[PDB]
Amino acid sequence: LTPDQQTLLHFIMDSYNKQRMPQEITNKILKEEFSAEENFLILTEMATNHVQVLVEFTKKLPGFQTLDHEDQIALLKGSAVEAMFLRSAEIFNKKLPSGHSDLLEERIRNSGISDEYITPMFSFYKSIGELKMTQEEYALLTAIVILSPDRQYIKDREAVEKLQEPLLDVLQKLCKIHQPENPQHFACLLGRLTELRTFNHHHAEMLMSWRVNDHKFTPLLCEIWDVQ
């Protein structure tokens, strides 16, 4: 609605859309049943991808520059899993040809991840698809997640609050703009955030378990998630 808001919305969308998800890598695993290790190597590339565009999007967020530098880091490390799963959901729902969900689930059981965690991942992917999430919502929700003022190691919550609230205000106007008949849409969105939050634990477990089974990561993946 507000000019300050239309500018914010647009700056956020430009930045989110600039982030390129080359899909060669994905069409790789689609057309070929690789070996567990080689699948994992492909995952390592996808994960690296996620961190990279994460940081490229976060850099640009209006005001992110004005935060103390150790809060900058702390937001990044705290949001990476949540943001990475959101972007994964967008890719599942937009950048993959139809009718390959099961095949892709095969490929992921096979990468040394336990079913215990795969089942929740794809359910989340589908729940998002059922909301027919828009490009605005992906980008807003991503920014809202990154600028969560509730993260650990944040020296100055209020500064982060300041930057997250206008995002929240906008998102809920758009919910009402494009779905004035569904006043509850915004609340469903937030419920998807709560579900996102459960991946932090799953992710730490996915890593601790990969590591015990002799997988090696990259420096960078080790920094962001403190594997030491």
């Binding site: 990279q52 940081v55 490229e56 976060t58 850099k59 530098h69 900058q72 880091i73 990044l76 490390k77 420096p219 960078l220 920094e223 962001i224």
Partner: peptide, 10 residues
């Protein structure tokens, strides 16, 4: 955290 610091500042 030298690497994220590099990717944040350029």
């Amino acid at each position: 955290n030298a690497l994220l610091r590099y990717l944040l500042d350029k």
